[PDB]
Design a protein around this ligand. Structure first.
Ligand SMILES: CCCCCCCCCCC(CCCCCCCCCC)(CO[C@H]1O[C@@H](CO)[C@H](O[C@@H]2O[C@@H](CO)[C@H](O)[C@@H](O)[C@@H]2O)[C@@H](O)[C@@H]1O)CO[C@H]1O[C@@H](CO)[C@H](O[C@@H]2O[C@@H](CO)[C@H](O)[C@@H](O)[C@@H]2O)[C@@H](O)[C@H]1O
Ligand SMILES: CCCCCCCCCCC(CCCCCCCCCC)(CO[C@H]1O[C@@H](CO)[C@H](O[C@@H]2O[C@@H](CO)[C@H](O)[C@@H](O)[C@@H]2O)[C@@H](O)[C@@H]1O)CO[C@H]1O[C@@H](CO)[C@H](O[C@@H]2O[C@@H](CO)[C@H](O)[C@@H](O)[C@@H]2O)[C@@H](O)[C@H]1O
Ligand SMILES: CCCCCCCCCCC(CCCCCCCCCC)(CO[C@H]1O[C@@H](CO)[C@H](O[C@@H]2O[C@@H](CO)[C@H](O)[C@@H](O)[C@@H]2O)[C@@H](O)[C@@H]1O)CO[C@H]1O[C@@H](CO)[C@H](O[C@@H]2O[C@@H](CO)[C@H](O)[C@@H](O)[C@@H]2O)[C@@H](O)[C@H]1O
Ligand SMILES: CCCCCCCCCCC(CCCCCCCCCC)(CO[C@H]1O[C@@H](CO)[C@H](O[C@@H]2O[C@@H](CO)[C@H](O)[C@@H](O)[C@@H]2O)[C@@H](O)[C@@H]1O)CO[C@H]1O[C@@H](CO)[C@H](O[C@@H]2O[C@@H](CO)[C@H](O)[C@@H](O)[C@@H]2O)[C@@H](O)[C@H]1O
Ligand SMILES: CCCCCCCCCCC(CCCCCCCCCC)(CO[C@H]1O[C@@H](CO)[C@H](O[C@@H]2O[C@@H](CO)[C@H](O)[C@@H](O)[C@@H]2O)[C@@H](O)[C@@H]1O)CO[C@H]1O[C@@H](CO)[C@H](O[C@@H]2O[C@@H](CO)[C@H](O)[C@@H](O)[C@@H]2O)[C@@H](O)[C@H]1O
Ligand SMILES: CCCCCCCCCCC(CCCCCCCCCC)(CO[C@H]1O[C@@H](CO)[C@H](O[C@@H]2O[C@@H](CO)[C@H](O)[C@@H](O)[C@@H]2O)[C@@H](O)[C@@H]1O)CO[C@H]1O[C@@H](CO)[C@H](O[C@@H]2O[C@@H](CO)[C@H](O)[C@@H](O)[C@@H]2O)[C@@H](O)[C@H]1O
Ligand SMILES: [Ca+2]
Ligand SMILES: [Ca+2]
Ligand SMILES: [Ca+2]
Ligand SMILES: [Ca+2]
Ligand SMILES: [Ca+2]
Ligand SMILES: [Ca+2]
Lengths: 201, 201, 201, 201, 201, 201
C-alpha cells in the first residue's frame, strides 16, 4: 500500500540532514550510472589495446600481467557493492522495525535506530577512504603511453604501447573526484550530528 | 496509491508555465532516446574506422589519440546525467515536502519551493551553456575526411582517412540543435517568471 | 488507481472517431515493432556488404560515403520519434487538465482540448508527408546490385557490388506502404471532423 | 483495479467456446516463444553458411540473392505481427465498450461485439491460409545441401554448398505444423458458432 | 486485487499433495534457469569446435550434419515448452472457473477440476517419458573426442576432433538426472491420488 | 495487497535472529551480483587465453580438456542455484500456510514451521560445506602461468601458457572467502537456536 511507504521513508530520514537525505544518494547513483554506461567503452578492450613488439611465445602475457594485476572495471565494481552493504543492512533493520511496531499501535525503540545510522556512516567513511588510497596506490593519476618490461620468458627489454591514454586518464580523474566528494559529505554529515563535540568529551 | 501521485504532480507543477510543464521534458527525453538508439551505430566503431597509411609500430595509436582525446559518445553521456542532477534534487526536495505536510493537515512553506525551482533552472542554464561551448571547441560543426599527423614515434608526416564523414556530420549538427533549443526554452521559462524585471531592480 | 485511468482514456478519446481511436495506434505500433525486430537484420551490416574492386587507400570509404550519406535505419528512427512528439504533448496536456479539474468537482474548458487534437493531427500530416517525399528522394523504390564511383582519391572508374538487394528492396517497399497508410488515415480523420466544410467557408 | 479486469475478461470471452478461450492463445504464444528462442540459432548465420567454389568478384552475392530473396526469419516475423492485428483491434474495441457502459449502469449493444468476433476470426483464417501457401511456394518442405547457379557476373555453372540442412529442415517442418493447427482450430471455432448452417441458408 | 489471487492459488492447489504443490514447480524452474544461464556457454559454439583434417570443399559440412542433425540446445528448448503446454491450459481453465463463479456467490463444478488435474499429469508423464528415451537415442550418455566420417563429397575416411568433451558430458548427465526426477515425482503424485487402486478395479 | 505481505514477512522471520534475518540474505545477494557483473569478464574467454606451442592436430584440445574439465563459471552457477533450492521450498511452505489460516481466523500449527526452518539451514550447511571442499579439490588457491601436458595425440611434452593469472587468482580467493562467511553464519544461526544443547542431550 501507499501509507506504509510514507512511513518507511519518514522513519528512515527522521534523524538525517539534507546532506544525507538528498545529496549523498544522488552522488552515489550518479557514479553507478556513469560506470555502467561509459566504463566498458573506455576499458573493455584493454587486452587488445596492449601491443608489445616481440615474437617470443609467452612474453606478451607476462608483461601485461605485470602492468595490470587488476583491471579498473573490476576494482570499481567491488567498491560500489561494498559501500552498498552497510546501507542494505540499515534499510532492512528499519523495515522490520516498522512491521513489528505497526502490530501494537496501529524513544528507547526510536533511539536504537540512531546508533544504526551513525554506525553505517562510520563504516562507509572507512570503506570510502581505504578505496581512494588503494586506487591511488594501484593506478595513480595518469595512464602512460609506453611500458618497459623485464621478466621471464622475455629475453631482454621489451617495449609495449598502449591505446587511448588521454581518454583513460580523463575517466580515471573523474572517478577519483566523484568518490572524493562522496567521502567529504559522509564526513560532513557526521559533524552535523555532533561528532565535533563527541570526540572532545 | 493514486491520490498521492496526483498531489506530487500538482505541487511540482504549480509555479511553472506550459513551457516548463510540457515542452522541456519532451525535448530532454527526445535527446536521450535518440542517443541510445542511434549513437552507437554512428560512432561505436570509431577506432576501426581510422586508417593510417604506415607501418611503424605505435604510430597509429599516437595519431588517433591526438585527433580525439574524448569520443562524442562519452561527452554526450556526461552532459545528459549532469543536467539531470539539478532536477533529481528538486524532485526529491518536493517528495519529502509532501510526505511531512500530509502528516499535519491530512505560503512560507510553499514559497521555499519557488526558490528551489528558480535555482535548478539557473544551474541548468549554466550547465547547458558551458556544454554547447565545449562541444563547439572540441569537435566544431564538421568532421573531416582526412587528417595530417606529426608526432612521435611517427617518422615524417602521416595521412589518415576516416569513414562515414557525412553521417557523422549530420548527427553532430542534429545534437547541437536539440541542445540549443533546450537552452532557449530554459531561458524563456525564467523570463516568464519575472527575470526581466528582477535584473532591472 | 483504476478510476483515474478510466477518466484519462475517456477524455482523450471523446472527440475522435474509430479511425483515430483504434486504427492509427495499431498502425504506428506495427511499424515500430517491425523496425525493431527485422531492421538490424536487413541493414545492420551495410558497410561490410559493400565490396569495391580496388586497392588504392581511401577509395572504398569515399565511394560508400557518396552512395549513402544516411543509412535507412537512422532515417526511420528519426521519423518515428518526430511523429511521436505531437502525441506526447497532447497526452501531457490532457493529463494535467484532468488532475486540476478533479480538485474542483470531485464546454469552455472541454473545447480547448478539441483545438489541441486538431493541431497535433495537422502537425502529423505535415511530418508524415515530408518524410515520405524525403524517403523517395533519398532511396527511391529499388536498391541496385552495382554502383559506379568517380571521386577522389580513386583513380578512374571503380565498380562496387552490393549484397542482398532483393531483401532490401522488399523491406523498403513495405515501409513506404505502412507509412503511406498512416498518412491516409490521418487525413481521413480530419475530414470526418469537418475539414471538408472548414476549407470551404 | 481488479474488478475492472474481471469484467474485461468475462466480456471478451462470453461468446467463444473452449477452443478459442484456451487452445488458440496457447498455440499462438507457443509459436512466438519458439521463434524467439531457437530461430536466430538455426537461421541467423545463413550468409556465412553459404560457400561457393569460385573467385570471380560479385558471383557469390548474385547466387545467394537468387537462392533466398527473403529469409525465413523475416517471413515468420511478418506473419506473427499481421495475425495479431485483427486481435489487437478487437481487444481495443472491447476496452472502450466497457469503459463507456460502466458510466451509465455502474442486447443491441452486446450484439455488435459478436459481429466483431466473427470478423477477426474470418480475417485470421484468410491471413493464416495465405501465409501457409506462400511458405510452401517459397521454401517447400526440404532445404537442399547443394545449389547450382547460372547468372551474371558468374562465368559458367557454379556449385554452392550449404551448412546444417537437416536442422533447418526440422525447424521448417515444425513451423508448418504449428501454423497448420492454428488454421484448423480457427476454422473449427467458426463451425461451432454456426458457420455450417449460415452458408446453407 | 489481493483477495482474488488468494482464491486462485487456493483453488489450484486444493486437490494436490506437497509433492505437486512445492517440489515439482521448484524442479521445473531449476531446469529452466540452468539451461538459460549455462547452456549457451557449453554448447553455443559447437560448429567452430568441430575440426576436420581435410581440404576438400563441402566435406566438413557433410560430416558435421551426420554427427548432429539436432543440437542439444534446440532439443531442450522444445522439451521445456511442450511440458509447459498442459500446465498453461489447466491454469487458464482454473482462471475462468473462478471468474464466473465469483459472479453468482460473491461439488459437480468442483469435480470437473479434478479430472483436469489428473489429465495434465498424465500428459506430462507421457511427454517426459518420450523425451528421455529420445534423448538417450540421439546423444547417449557420453560425448566422444573423435569421429570417423565416410560420406560424399569426402574422398576416403576423414577424422574429426571435438573440443571440451568432459564438460559436455557433465552437462548432459546433469540434465538426464533433473529430468529423471521430474518423471519420478509426476508418477508419485498420481499414485498418491489413487492410481494404485484405479488400475486394479 | 499490502497487509498480506506484512504477514508473510512477519511469519517467515518470527523464529530467526538478526544473523539470519539481515546478514545472510545480504551475503548471498552480494555473491550473486558479483558473479553476474564481473565473472564473464575474468573467465569468459578462457579457451582463447590458452596457448600451446605446437602444430599437431588435436593436441591443443586434448591438453585444455585435461587442465579444466569444468569451468569455474559453470561450477559457481550450479552452487548458487542448489543453495537456493532449500530456501524456495521453505518460502513456498510458508506462503500456503498463511493462505489457508487466513480463511479460518481472518502452536501445533506454528511449530511445524520451526522444524522446516531448522531443516533448510541444515541442508544449506551440508551443501555449502561440500561445495567449498570440491572447489579446493578442483582449482586450489592459485592459477598457474604454465602447464605441462603429456597425452594422446600429442607427441612428447607440450608446454602451454595462460593469460591473466593474477586477476584470476584474486577472483578465486574472493569467492572462497564470501562462501566461507556464508558457511560460518549458517552454523552460528543454528547454535543460537540451541544446537549446542541439542547435540548434548
Ligand atoms: C568556448 C571557450 C571554452 C574554453 C574551454 C577551455 C577548456 C580546455 C579543455 C581541455 C580538454 C577537455 C576534455 C573534456 C573533459 C570533460 C570532462 C567529462 C568527461 C566525461 C566523463 C581538451 O581540450 C583540448 O582539445 C584538443 C583537441 O585535440 C585541442 O587541440 C587543438 O585545438 C583544436 C581546436 O579545434 C584543434 O582542432 C586541434 O588540432 C589542436 O591540436 C586543444 O587545444 C584543447 O586544449 C582536455 O585536455 C587534454 O589535453 C591533452 C593534451 O596532451 C592531454 O593529454 C595528455 O598528454 C598526452 C601527451 O603527452 C599524453 O599522451 C596523455 O596521456 C595525456 O592525457 C589530456 O590529458 C587533456 O588534458
Ligand atoms: C520531394 C522534394 C524534397 C526536396 C528535398 C530537398 C532536401 C535536400 C536534402 C539534403 C541531404 C538530406 C540528409 C537528410 C537529413 C535528415 C536529418 C535527420 C537526421 C537523423 C538523426 C541529402 O540530399 C542529397 O542526397 C544525395 C544522395 O547521394 C543526392 O545525390 C544525388 O541525387 C540522388 C537522387 O537519387 C542520386 O541518386 C545521386 O546519385 C546523386 O548524386 C543529392 O542530390 C541530395 O542533395 C543532406 O545533403 C548532404 O550532402 C552532402 C554532399 O556532399 C554533404 O556532404 C559534405 O560534403 C562532403 C564532400 O566534400 C564531405 O565529405 C562531407 O563531410 C560533408 O558531409 C552532406 O553534409 C549533406 O549536406
Ligand atoms: C499457392 C500459390 C501462391 C502464389 C504466390 C504468388 C506470389 C509471388 C511472390 C513473389 C515474391 C514474394 C516475396 C514475399 C514478400 C512478402 C512481403 C512481406 C515482407 C516481410 C516484411 C517471391 O517469389 C519468387 O520466389 C522465387 C524464389 O527464388 C521463385 O523462384 C523460382 O521458383 C522457385 C519455386 O520453388 C524455385 O525454387 C526457384 O528455383 C525458381 O527460380 C519465383 O518463382 C517467385 O516468383 C517476390 O518476387 C521477387 O522476385 C525477384 C525476381 O528478380 C525480384 O528481384 C528483383 O530483380 C533482381 C534481378 O534483376 C534484382 O537484382 C533485385 O534487386 C530485384 O529485387 C524481387 O524484387 C521480388 O519481386
Ligand atoms: C527409445 C526408442 C525411441 C525410438 C525413436 C524413433 C524416432 C526416430 C527419430 C528420427 C530423427 C529425430 C529428430 C528429432 C526431432 C524432434 C522434433 C522437435 C524439433 C525441435 C524444434 C533423428 O534420428 C536419427 O538420428 C541419427 C543420429 O545421427 C541416428 O544415426 C544412427 O544412430 C545413432 C544412434 O546413436 C548412431 O550414433 C549414428 O552413428 C547412426 O548413424 C539415426 O539412427 C536416427 O534415425 C530425425 O531423422 C533425421 O534423419 C536424417 C537422415 O538423413 C534426415 O536427413 C535428411 O537426409 C539427409 C541426407 O540426404 C539430407 O542431407 C538432409 O537434408 C535431410 O534432413 C533428417 O531429415 C531426419 O529425418
Ligand atoms: C575434499 C574431498 C572431496 C573429494 C571429491 C571426490 C569427487 C571426485 C570429482 C570428479 C570430477 C567432478 C566434476 C564436478 C561435477 C559437479 C556437477 C555439477 C555440474 C554443473 C552443472 C572431477 O575430478 C577430477 O578432477 C581432475 C582435475 O583435472 C583431477 O585431476 C588430478 O588431480 C588434480 C588435483 O589438483 C590435479 O591438479 C590434476 O593435475 C590431476 O590430474 C582428478 O583427480 C579428479 O578426479 C569429474 O571427474 C571427471 O574425470 C574425467 C577423467 O577423465 C572424466 O573424463 C572422461 O574421460 C576422458 C578421457 O578418456 C574423456 O575424454 C572424457 O570425454 C570423459 O569425460 C570426466 O568425465 C569426469 O568423470
Ligand atoms: C595508501 C597505502 C595503501 C597500502 C596498500 C597495501 C596493499 C597491497 C596490495 C596488494 C595487491 C592488491 C590487489 C587489490 C585486491 C582488491 C580485492 C578486491 C578484488 C575485486 C573483486 C596489488 O599491489 C601491488 O600492485 C603492484 C602493481 O603492479 C605494485 O607494483 C609496483 O608498484 C607500483 C606502484 O605504482 C609500480 O607502478 C609498479 O611498477 C611496481 O612493480 C606492487 O607494489 C603492489 O604490491 C595484490 O598483490 C598482487 O601481487 C602480485 C605480485 O606477484 C601477485 O602475483 C602473484 O605472483 C605472480 C608472479 O609469480 C604470479 O604470476 C601470479 O599468479 C600471482 O598472482 C598477486 O597475486 C597479488 O598478490
Ligand atoms: Ca584518447
Ligand atoms: Ca556517410
Ligand atoms: Ca536477397
Ligand atoms: Ca544439421
Ligand atoms: Ca572440458
Ligand atoms: Ca592479471
Amino acid at each position: 500500500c501507499g501509507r506504509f511507504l510514507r512511513r518507511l521513508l519518514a522513519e528512515e530520514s527522521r534523524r538525517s540532514t539534507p546532506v544525507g537525505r538528498l545529496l549523498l544518494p544522488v552522488l552515489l547513483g550518479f557514479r553507478l550510472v556513469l560506470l555502467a554506461a561509459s566504463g566498458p567503452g573506455v576499458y573493455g578492450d584493454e587486452q587488445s589495446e596492449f601491443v608489445c613488439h616481440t615474437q617470443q611465445p609467452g612474453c606478451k602475457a607476462a608483461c601485461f600481467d605485470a602492468f595490470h594485476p587488476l583491471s579498473p572495471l573490476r576494482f570499481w565494481v567491488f567498491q560500489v557493492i561494498l559501500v552498498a552493504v552497510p546501507s542494505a543492512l540499515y534499510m532492512g533493520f528499519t523495515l522490520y522495525h516498522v512491521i513489528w511496531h505497526w502490530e501494537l499501535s496501529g524513544g528507547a525503540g526510536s533511539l536504537r535506530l540512531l546508533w544504526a545510522y551513525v554506525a553505517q556512516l562510520g563504516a562507509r567513511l572507512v570503506l570510502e577512504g581505504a578505496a581512494l588510497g588503494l586506487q591511488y596506490h594501484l593506478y595513480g593519476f595518469q595512464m602512460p603511453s609506453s611500458f618497459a618490461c623485464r621478466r621471464e620468458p622475455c629475453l631482454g627489454s621489451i617495449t609495449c604501447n598502449l591505446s587511448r591514454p588521454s581518454e583513460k586518464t580523463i575517466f580515471l580523474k573523474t572517478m577519483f573526484g566523484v568518490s572524493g566528494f562522496c567521502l567529504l559529505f559522509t564526513f560532513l554529515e557526521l559533524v552535523l550530528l555532533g561528532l565535533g563535540r563527541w570526540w572532545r568529551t
